[PDB]
Amino acid sequence: RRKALPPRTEKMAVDQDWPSVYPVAAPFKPSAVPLPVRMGYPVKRGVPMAKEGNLELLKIPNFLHLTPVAIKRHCEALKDFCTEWPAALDSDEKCEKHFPIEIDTADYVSAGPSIRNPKARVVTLRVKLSSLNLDDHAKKKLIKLVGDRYCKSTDVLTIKTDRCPLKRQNYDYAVYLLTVLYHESWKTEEWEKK
Amino acid sequence: SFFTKLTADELWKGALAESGAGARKGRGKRTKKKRRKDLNRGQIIGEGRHGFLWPGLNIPLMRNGAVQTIAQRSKEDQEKVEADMVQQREEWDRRRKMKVKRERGWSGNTWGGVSLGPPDPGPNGETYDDFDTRILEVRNVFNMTAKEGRKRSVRVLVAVGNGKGAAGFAI
């Protein structure tokens, strides 16, 4: 007993909305799509293949759940979740006076059962040295203490930490390195007078 | 070793060796006979040698309006169903080893005098069941080519006739 039904194209209305049909990621099922779409290399007398029984349309990624009207609806839904950026921090220079420390961290996404990427442990802490209370002699001791991590042109200090298993432990170790450099830069010891 | 194995089409194509160089020119037919049997014929899809009885493949979903449970037949039922399968296999073998008798026209091995029934209908829908066609000569004719060397071309001569006075011959 064989049964055959016409697809959803005949029952599809003119003014029906598409995000109600396609909520999430889909394999481009051709029965629910009313568009006659053709892809494939044609024969010299032939035409490209239609949407039924075609694996190239099954291979291709689809943006049918990302139609622009659906983008407007979804972003109007996410509008309640977002918060406003401060008006006083609009400029890079005022950001430089207010928040001098910037921290580069990375998160990675991949298709697979495993989440962990070993390069995700890295933490790169950058500080402009003009925003601190280092003295002259303490500043010179800071450059001779840290060496290559300080840029002589743009006057920035960059500490990259890798050794800790977690990004929070790397962040704590980097900010610990910054504060121990600050506390040990001011110390004048007995061999510093020679 | 599960990744190592292959597909039945590849296995049969490597087994019968129909594309080999022996059958190409005519070098074959000395000691060459391979038979292809479809192994997916008598499969009930859910049949297994342990004998598990599945609610969708082997037996239907609903009994007395209720939902059936996953069950297993008895061992005695297992050699009964296995006996039915293997007896189907020698039934297929008995049907396969039976050969149709070839009606001889003039001699035992020649094609002279053998009839081929009515000729094929034409493009206009005309159908000729009253004519009969007979082979008078079969002859293997060879040709010399640049690539293949010997090129065997079978030519035959037949006659058609309805028995009412209309007859013809062709090659």
Partner: protein, 49 residues
């Protein structure tokens, strides 16, 4: 883990949810060989007998 792969797929083959054409081919060829009469001997009978 090829052992677990082969064991799982063999158990599915005998439980009749997966159908394996290659082991079907080996079973049919061994059946034809035993029908012809040239099979695998018992362990220990080959050399002295």
């Amino acid at each position: 883990n090829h052992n677990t792969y082969f064991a799982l797929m063999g158990t599915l083959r005998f439980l009749g949810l997966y159908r394996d054409e290659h082991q079907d081919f080996r079973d049919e060829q061994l059946r034809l060989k035993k029908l012809r009469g040239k099979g695998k001997p018992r362990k220990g009978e080959g050399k002295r007998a």
